[PDB]
């Protein structure tokens, strides 16, 4: 019945989708664990760098200087990988929705407001007399084009200072 | 079966849609005709202004100033109307598509390119071992997560100037 | 089930393909290693040619003149071989894909846009009335040929200056 | 089994495809008929213009100028339509093939010629020792990487004018 | 007949609605039970904390100190969940009504009072002479605009201290 959805997720899409979001969330928590338990190794080193900064021991600071870099080299790729999954998990939750009734109602009512703003504009009045005379008495669209009968075309305050300005 | 689309276009949407687009190009040509047949009234007036520009008759030029104003007031409301319909006819064609197979193929093939760019990032390769081990041998998604298995990573050129910089 | 794929890669194609891309990537890294470790022999010689250029020693420059050529003769074939594998590995990754669902969706949605641009052209309108009346209510193609009902054929602004130009 | 092709052509693609190509040659002949039967109205008019060219009657030639314009306005929209259908019928035949065995043999036998040109380049022979030692004795690919084993390389005529040129 | 109501609640809305309010009320009573039977475990602990507060037993209070926190941690999420369902059950009873005759009469009679307050304002009197002369003798609205004939426009006590204040 829907072939593009099965061309992406396979012969049973609804169990392929919950099979990624198991795996893509187990790895989403192992990053948040390995930044929780690796921040405290950064927090203890801030107590151990500040310890031997007042001790002024060369053999102590240069021994912490090796492990402070190798963990911050580990931190900068695990902090990156948290933003890597969140780019994947957001683009793949967008693929999972993609044709839902929830997005169909949310994107249509946001569009019917944008049509309702445009059908009341006065220069397309004479379209709406012709359009009301032709359409079926349908739902949203035909209920807008007959609700816009609140305008007639009449002359207003014209310019007189431009008539003598054309000869000028 | 199709409730949002019938709520917008009525109980038979496919004939409501071609009933608008029929009307909305009848007015699409009547604007384009009345910008064409009224430009040549502005074109003949540019000759008749240039006629009595050398005659230097105030009783001739200001008689054209009464009718040149009535055409350019008419032109600027009809030139506006061409932008009025084309704002409506573009939004009301977006409402006609809105859930089609034509949008389903277009908005998803451009979405699978964006996932193919993200699954190949080397920080999340450790996810793609676990993800390839779990998924059904599906279409697009499970064909991308094992087409990223044709690569492996290894350690590189570490910084040798970092330890003395950290103790600095 | 697919015989051309097995006529190229043998009785088990999926393990022939990952057996090349092991070998064709080990050699892809031995070139990048042997241009990394041979550039530094070119970089030290730029310190040793510039050394004895100010020393003005004939017996030093003409001894570096032998090894500068034999390494640049080595460099120019190893730099070539990097572009040799990348021509092979790109033509053989194209053979590995060649019938994938990923290329099937990417090359079809790029083609359905090219059909959508052509079916709306006005001279083939009277085809599309006949074509809509005949086709099944299918997916992408039949959803395009009934969406193009937004045009009727009517006369426009004809030429009058060519009628008296035929006698001219 | 075939999801992209059924998404384009519907649940039975093979009868949707011959249902378009049936319609799209019915109009393929009606354009070719109406360019043939309308050329002879242009052909008889070239005699009747040449009739009253020597009669020198303005009341005869300009009566043909009213009907010669109505045929060449009709001819130029029907001559355009022959290029309109042939742009559609070529693209919609490309959509019908798009994944066939006929394209799989044609696009791959032309691809194996291009790999056969690249595996015989002598800079990458050192890959083809390691590649022949690893691959299964397959079809086309492993038959090319050992049909390039009927050759060997050796050092050639070195430059004797390079050392003095480098010290120059 | 009503498509938005079926797009939300499905093909039979009236049995989807009483299928939530079964489930959403069973859970509404299991919270009120599990705060009724968990308050008495808080009430007995207030008799057991106040028991060993005068006994001054360290091994008794610190043993009740473990279970007093684990139940108040249980209480603070079950007290929250009572306010969680009542936010859901009130927003989903608002969805169930949403177009009823009961809300149609209650929101219209509250609106007709607001129109009745505004049509009697004296500056829009001259509208109501024109409006009474045009409308059909309808229900509520036309019965208000002819009931407002109890006013005529006449001059009152004008200011004289502002005439000499303009020159001032």
Numbering used by the authors:
A (entry chain A), B (entry chain B), C (entry chain A), D (entry chain B), E (entry chain A): 1 to 168
Per the authors:
ESCRT-III proteins mediate a range of cellular membrane remodeling activities such as multivesicular body biogenesis, cytokinesis, and viral release. Critical to these processes is the assembly of ESCRT-III subunits into polymeric structures. Budding yeast has a total of eight ESCRT-III proteins with the core subunits Vps20, Snf7, Vps24, and Vps2, as well as the accessory proteins Did2, Vps60, Chm7, and Ist1 (3). ESCRT-III proteins are directly involved in membrane remodeling and scission.
Here, we present the 3.2-Å resolution cryo-EM structure of an extended Vps24 conformation organized in a double-stranded helical filament. Using the class averages and a real-space approach, we determined the helical symmetry and found that 11.09 units per turn make up a pitch of 279 Å. The determined Vps24 structure in the filament corresponds to an elongated conformation extending to 100 Å in length. Each extended Vps24 monomer packs against another Vps24 molecule to form a domain-swapped dimer. In this domain-swapped dimer, the helical repeating unit contains two Vps24 molecules that are distanced apart by 25.2 Å in translation and 32.5° by a left-handed rotation along the helical axis, making up a single protofilament. Within the studied Vps24 filaments, the extended Vps24 conformation forms a domain-swapped dimer that makes up the basic unit of two distinct protofilaments. The tightly integrated Vps24 molecule shares buried interaction surfaces with three neighboring Vps24 molecules inside a single strand of the assembly. The N-terminal helix α0 including positive K5 and K6 points into the core of the filament. In our cryo-EM structure, we find that helix α5 binds to the hairpin formed by helix α1′/α2′ of the corresponding domain-swapped dimer. The interactions between two protofilaments are scarce (N12, K133) and give rise to solvent-accessible cavities up to 10-Å distance between the molecules from the neighboring strands.
